[PDB]
A paper describes a structure:
Mixed lineage leukemia (MLL) family enzymes, including MLL1-4/KMT2A-2D, SET1A/KMT2F, and SET1B/KMT2G, are the major histone lysine 4 (K4) methyltransferases in mammals. The MLL family enzymes share an evolutionarily conserved catalytic Su(Var), Enhancer of Zeste, Trithorax (SET) domain14 as well as four highly conserved SET-interacting proteins, i.e., RbBP5 (retinoblastoma-binding protein 5), ASH2L (Absent, small, homeotic disks-2-like), WDR5 (WD40 repeat-containing protein 5), and DPY30 (DumPY protein 30). Here we report the single-particle cryo-EM structure of the human MLL1 core complex bound to the NCP. Importantly, we show that the MLL1 core complex docks on the NCP through concurrent interactions of ASH2L/RbBP5 with nucleosomal DNA and histone H4.
The structure showed that RbBP5 bound to the NCP by simultaneously engaging DNA (SHL1.5) and histone H4 N-terminal tail. The I-loop was positioned between the N-terminal tail of histone H4 and nucleosomal DNA. The A-loop run parallel to the H4 tail, which was positioned between the I-/A-loops of RbBP5 and the helix α1 (Leu65–Asp77) of histone H3. The mutation of Quad-R significantly reduced RbBP5 binding to the NCP, whereas deletion of the I- and A-loops had only a modest effect on NCP binding.
Author numbering:
A (entry chain I), B (entry chain M): 12 to 118
C (entry chain A): 18 to 331
D (entry chain N), E (entry chain J): 29 to 121
F (entry chain L), G (entry chain H): 20 to 101
H (entry chain K), I (entry chain G): 37 to 134
The structure:
Amino acid sequence: AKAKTRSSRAGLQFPVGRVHRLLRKGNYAERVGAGAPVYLAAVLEYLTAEILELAGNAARDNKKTRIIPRHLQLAVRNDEELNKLLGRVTIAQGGVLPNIQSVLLPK
Amino acid sequence: AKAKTRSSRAGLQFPVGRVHRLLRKGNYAERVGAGAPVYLAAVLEYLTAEILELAGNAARDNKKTRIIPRHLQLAVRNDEELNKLLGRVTIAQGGVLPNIQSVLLPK
Amino acid sequence: DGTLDCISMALTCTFNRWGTLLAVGCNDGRIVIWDFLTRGIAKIISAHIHPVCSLCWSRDGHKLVSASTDNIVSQWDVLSGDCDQRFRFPSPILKVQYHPRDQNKVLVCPMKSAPVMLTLSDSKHVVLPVDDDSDLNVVASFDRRGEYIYTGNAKGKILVLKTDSQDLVASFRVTTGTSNTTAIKSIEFARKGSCFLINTADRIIRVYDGREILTCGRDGEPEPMQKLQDLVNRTPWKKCCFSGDGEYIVAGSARQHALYIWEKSIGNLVKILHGTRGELLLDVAWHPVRPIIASISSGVVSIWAQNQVENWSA
Amino acid sequence: TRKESYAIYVYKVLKQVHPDTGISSKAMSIMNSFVNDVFERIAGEASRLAHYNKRSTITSREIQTAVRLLLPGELAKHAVSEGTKAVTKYTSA
Amino acid sequence: TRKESYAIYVYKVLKQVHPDTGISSKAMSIMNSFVNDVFERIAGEASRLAHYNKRSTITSREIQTAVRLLLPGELAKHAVSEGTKAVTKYTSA
Amino acid sequence: KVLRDNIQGITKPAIRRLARRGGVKRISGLIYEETRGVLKVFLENVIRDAVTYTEHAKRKTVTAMDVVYALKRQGRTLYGFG
Amino acid sequence: KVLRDNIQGITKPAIRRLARRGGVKRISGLIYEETRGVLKVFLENVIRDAVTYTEHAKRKTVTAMDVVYALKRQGRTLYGFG
Amino acid sequence: KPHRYRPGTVALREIRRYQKSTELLIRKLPFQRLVREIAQDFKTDLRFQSSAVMALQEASEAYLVALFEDTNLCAIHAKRVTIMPKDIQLARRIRGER
Amino acid sequence: KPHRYRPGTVALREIRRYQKSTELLIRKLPFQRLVREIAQDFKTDLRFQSSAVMALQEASEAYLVALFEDTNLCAIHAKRVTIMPKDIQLARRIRGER
DNA sequence: ATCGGATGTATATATCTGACACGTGCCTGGAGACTAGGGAGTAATCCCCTTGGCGGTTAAAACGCGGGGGACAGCGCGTACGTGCGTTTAAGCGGTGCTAGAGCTGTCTACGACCAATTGAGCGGCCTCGGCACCGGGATTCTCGA
DNA sequence: TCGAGAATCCCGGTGCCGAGGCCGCTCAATTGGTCGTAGACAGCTCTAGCACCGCTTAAACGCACGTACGCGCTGTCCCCCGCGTTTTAACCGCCAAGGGGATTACTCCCTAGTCTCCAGGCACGTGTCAGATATATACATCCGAT
């Protein structure tokens, strides 16, 4: 009767028990494997780390401590693979990255 | 006690029991309602009737009996609602409805 | 960058050991041995009346071999100008080649027959074998070391045999990208080491190294040291060969009357000497010890001087 | 291996709407896959909607709403009409 | 009513990535919605794959295939490496 | 308490600022009301689906989740609200 | 039995007939090989996903269902094969 | 001597400013009344959560930004710098909105 | 006196013919070898069902037809009748393929 | 190309907050422990479909060959649109006020789940014939120099 | 601008294999019950949405006006269409080996399901400081006189 959360067993910061319960009661399959929630929480944690890295980078670049939606937009737009992941997704208070076309410049 | 299929009781041609089995094995809910497969068979029959009527009209217009994929594609493209339903769909051997732009015509 | 108007009716061009004499088998069946230094005639030997399809210089630059369209293979000398040998055999010849290390064996490639190595001393000759048994258009060439013969069939199959025993020391059917087969146009060599090249009919010159070829032996999968072609025009080359130093390789685009020189190691295109658009290029060769390129277009000889930076700035 | 399909039902519906009209096996397979795709889309939308309402039983109302969502306009109108009529016919017995 | 979310976990991974920085409530809601969306994408792909293989047990291999399908290139590579490491650490308990 | 004819709630300078955000330099007048139609058209899709969800929910108002799902089923999913 | 460099399997007259089907009247040469790239690019998506499905199937060949699912997950579903 | 910038310069400056900024470029209450008036087409006395209404408005605003983006693209492709209704119709046609 | 049609007329006739026709406008074996060569990027000795290969080829062919369609649309919008690589790039950009 | 000037924009400082970090008590969902069953893994076999190759045909790709026509660049223009200045309008805040409907809880019932017993609808497999693919030819119809 | 000439429409005839009707032979659909529970309904709550007031003011409407960019026309000129020849390799038909695809039969290790327990997560306060707003300043930038 030694208590220990499954997230610690995987050494992650996402709730493996919660995602396992959700995959169970979410009607995706008759049965759910044991390591599948661990793997899914792992990939979710990796994706969150990847996006939050660029988010905090842009926030520090703008001298802002708390990350704002604009920083999320800049992060997901500057990255190539991340933008390809969210190619048809919009963000609240996201706006558009600064982008001026070539000919539009004065001459 | 004799047995009659539900489609006969519903006055339908599509297999109601087969749709019920598909819904059960499809992991769409913990338990499918009684009238849900009947309703689904009904709407599927209506859609098939519409598309096949248009296809047969096109085939009779082409002086042929055997409905070929070309007739199906032409019938699909010759209806606004059906096109919007299948705009993201590619039909085999379909080609494109005969269409030429304006300026491409000589003078 | 030059021409030779005194030479007319040209069909072939070959270089001697020092490359100072160009043998021109003329349309009227004569051989003009033209000297490079004096830019004039070194010898003229009226061999026959049939156009010479191919010539080949001796290792010591003394003997020469003519192959007229009369199905006649003959051997002559540069100085005497007398017919040392003359023989007739059917299936007119496309390529004759002296043994690079021997002055008796000469390779001769007939149309409807397998290549035959004939002895200059006596009446002995060895018929080279055939893999696919239905070539009917086959090329062959002696190796640079005078120890092997590469034979290319009409279906990409290449047999490397020993120049003496003609035993199977290597064999490989080369791909064509599309994994099909292709009739071998030419198999030529360089003067240095063993790096050689194969010009095919699917417009891909393959720069191979004969060491790995001999190493693979049976059912080998050899890949060329370099791939050469014209990506923008897709020109089947009538003849391809190394430069004088061998580090560069020249190919003769006959359809558009030009010469294309690439490298060997990296194989990048050195440059393109595009001749006059009018004529039809037939033959091409490079001076073995000089940066000179002797081409032959529509029957007349043209010269290309890759002059270095001097002669105008010193 | 018994491979379940809808060919016979498409044939019946065709004979109903078009008595003396033929159909190719290729076009029959296209129609079968089209039925399968429409059924998949409708079932997925209905399941998502039912889950959004924290329900667990896909019923006639769910399918009607999913049809109103997926088909545009008069197609959806005639579809809901036919579905209601079939539901009435089945429930009457 | 305890309407759950992923807020605390996003906060934790943020602190472990950048301790000095913080995050607003709206940005946290965006992160929660994005997590839910990508997780539902992966779940749907896994369910579709399981149905395609007629298997009723979603396991780690299904998630591997789903993430290799969804995430592009190097994202997928790093994600599958992290997932394999995590599942190996967990199974070695 | 009935609303009508408020399509002009979107104004010419508002559309112009929106186009400026879109990087547009010069705009013709015939665009503005034209754009309005487009905008309205757009709503007639999502708005419809929105109420449809509420129609199934047997409720009488619209939640954020409703419009999020409506945009999702239209391939225009939106984050920040669930 | 190894294949390579067969991108020219698509030919200029083939692309031209395809464009004619697309109703194109006049075409520049710089299109042709350009188009090739596009085509190749397209495959690098679906083809990839294709083998991925087989990768999960622990098989060694590709079935029609595989490429159908690959096109489906890319919003380009295809009928006629399941 | 009053000073006036050349045309487009003020437009470019406003473009930079708005690309940098993030707030909504549409007045709240007019858009809300418009949403109510349009929803009248489906059922009366339909209420709305304020947050839901601004979410809808901002999603549609971002869709409008995107649409203006491709219209600008087709315009600069047409060797022009002024968008025209034909360009918007072309963009919506390519996107598959008709 | 040899006869020659004006340019485009034969092109328009072929357009009508191919719009009427339905067979594949790409040779089978070259496309199949291309698919094998491209799949070599993921695993060797990968076999393919013939029907699967023609299904892939025809789906990609229809995608190419669609792409040429919008390129034609942007071209006729640009007051031109000759498609250009910039037009294809614009079409793929609007479709969201880059 | 240059310099003075106006305008707009980035900055520092003040300072003022309200959203935000976190500390807490409590709940319930997640971890532990245990039991059943059976989907998945293994192996062995059968076989269909794949890959491979060869030979003859020609439809088709490649190449080239004139030549006319759309792409494009320049030029002119005038109309429509940015821009700045006004005047005028509802937009935004917040403030209170009413309550209609979300939103929660508690039933109790009617409604599938599920299990078993039963069997004809449906499906692999088998003839079989005629609509249709192909074709030969002849009339028909679009186009291009007069 | 009317014939000449080339590509298409169509009519009739030939022959074939796919479409279709039919046949055993399952097994998945039907029917009858019993169980446990999903949610329909009733009822109570409160809060968030709805509506009006008023107040200030940023923002919208309209005008005047310069002006510059869409548009239209000329002229050139490349370049791609068009059509002939020449090449090839796609295709198709056939034959071959086997290799993984698919199936079936065992077998069990894994997971659903159940009960117990407690502990991390979550609603809810609580200071508190990161950033939002104003102001004055200092600099970067466009633009006209030169």
